[PDB]
Design a protein around this ligand. Structure first.
Ligand SMILES: Nc1ncnc2c1ncn2[C@@H]1O[C@H](CO)[C@@H](O)[C@H]1O
Ligand SMILES: Nc1ncnc2c1ncn2[C@@H]1O[C@H](CO)[C@@H](O)[C@H]1O
Ligand SMILES: [Cl-]
Ligand SMILES: [Cl-]
Ligand SMILES: [Mg+2]
Ligand SMILES: [Mg+2]
Ligand SMILES: [Mg+2]
Length: 342
């Protein structure tokens, strides 16, 4: 509808990808398909990747990807979607700012110089992708230094829908809570992503602190299974987990929670107050698949583009499947000049 109607915040990261071999995964004790945070023991990993293999660089970060995709589907006006995050004052940081602008997103960064711009290694093997996030500057986001400044907070107050990936809970749970409480107080929509199994395992306390404020929860089938185990649900059935998650304690009685769990090429599951329904993924051709992680970010971006236009949930799901089908066959969450969705 109008400028700054959709708000997002998270970790701005420059993706570094390359096809590697079994020896490289074994050397760093990497699982073929996984997403983890970079420890001190992984400093060797990033240098060896860039020195032993052919790498490509693409602007990334989960929430940033979803916001760029939402803006793409909205088309007009420019700057309908806002994004906040922290970066370094370097060449990598200039790449991220340049790409956010070309995407027509209203991006406002917290720039500092103690830490370099964050990066994320994507170690590819065939149809598998092992991700390692070295947050660096991204982990320096401080609400008192950015989110709380008058000029920035005003942008959050213009939003009708807010979205933050669960990944940001490892950096600023206080920022996530300030935004979630504001939405609850002003009967606006607050949405969140489970993001990765490690969020439901090691950061479950911050996750459960924010849950009462979550109007719409997104996640894939492995994140749903981990969340169920850690919360003691005692079931591994995706439809039952969606039902129990939907029923969790909620603050704002004016909006019932909606839970959406994707299952790759299998049906997308949606739980509402009254039932649990399934939506087929009609794009079944596997041949040209490239990036399933980015496909999940694009699914959320498509869904959000229709939620701000006030469309039925059926249409939000169709838009999510459409955007995921475009991004899944490309690198760097890129897409054609204009969407073909009416
Ligand atoms: N800890 C993290 N925080 C934010 N984004 C992440 C994290 N780990 C992986 N990603 C992102 O996931 C995206 C693909 O889904 C990549 O662009 C990558 O940068
Ligand atoms: N193997 C796959 N085949 C087809 N579509 C897929 C596949 N994996 C993911 N997707 C699409 O990406 C979305 C997020 O994973 C899915 O709900 C689906 O729309
Ligand atoms: Cl993020
Ligand atoms: Cl997903
Ligand atoms: Mg090992
Ligand atoms: Mg595989
Ligand atoms: Mg995901």
């Amino acid at each position: 509808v109008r400028e700054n109607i959709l708000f997002g915040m998270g970790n701005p990261l420059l993706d570094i990808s390359a096809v590697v071999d079994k020896d490289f995964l074994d050397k760093y004790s990497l699982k073929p398909n996984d997403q983890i945070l970079a420890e001190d023991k992984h400093k060797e990993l990033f240098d060896e990747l860039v020195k032993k293999f052919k790498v490509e660089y693409h602007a990334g970060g989960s929430t940033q990807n979803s916001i760029k995709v939402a803006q793409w589907m909205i088309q007009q006006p420019h700057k309908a979607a806002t994004f906040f995050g922290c970066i370094g004052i370097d060449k990598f940081g200039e790449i991220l700012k340049r790409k956010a602008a070309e995407a027509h997103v209203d991006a406002h960064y917290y720039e500092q110089n103690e830490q370099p711009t964050g990066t994320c290694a994507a170690c590819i093997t065939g149809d598998n992708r092992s991700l390692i996030a070295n947050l660096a500057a991204a982990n320096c986001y401080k609400k008192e230094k950015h989110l709380d400044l008058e000029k920035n907070w005003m942008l959050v107050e213009k939003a009708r829908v807010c979205y933050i990936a669960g990944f940001f809970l490892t950096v600023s749970p206080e920022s996530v809570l300030k935004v979630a409480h504001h939405a609850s107080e002003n009967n606006r929509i607050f949405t969140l992503n489970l993001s990765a199994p490690f969020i439901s395992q090691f950061y479950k306390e911050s996750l459960m602190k924010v849950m009462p404020y979550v109007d719409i929860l997104f996640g894939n089938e492995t994140e749903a299974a981990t969340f169920a185990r850690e919360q003691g649900f005692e079931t591994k059935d995706i439809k039952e987990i969606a039902k129990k998650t939907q029923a969790l304690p909620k603050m704002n009685s004016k909006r019932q929670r909606i839970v959406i769990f994707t299952q790759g090429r299998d049906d997308t599951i949606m739980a509402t107050e009254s039932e649990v329904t399934a939506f087929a993924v009609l794009d079944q051709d596997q041949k040209e698949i490239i990036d399933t992680n980015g496909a999940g970010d694009a699914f959320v971006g498509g869904f959000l583009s229709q939620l701000v236009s006030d469309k039925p949930l059926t249409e939000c799901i169709r838009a999510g499947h459409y955007a995921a089908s475009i991004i899944i066959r490309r690198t760097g969450c890129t897409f054609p000049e204009k969407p073909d969705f009416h």
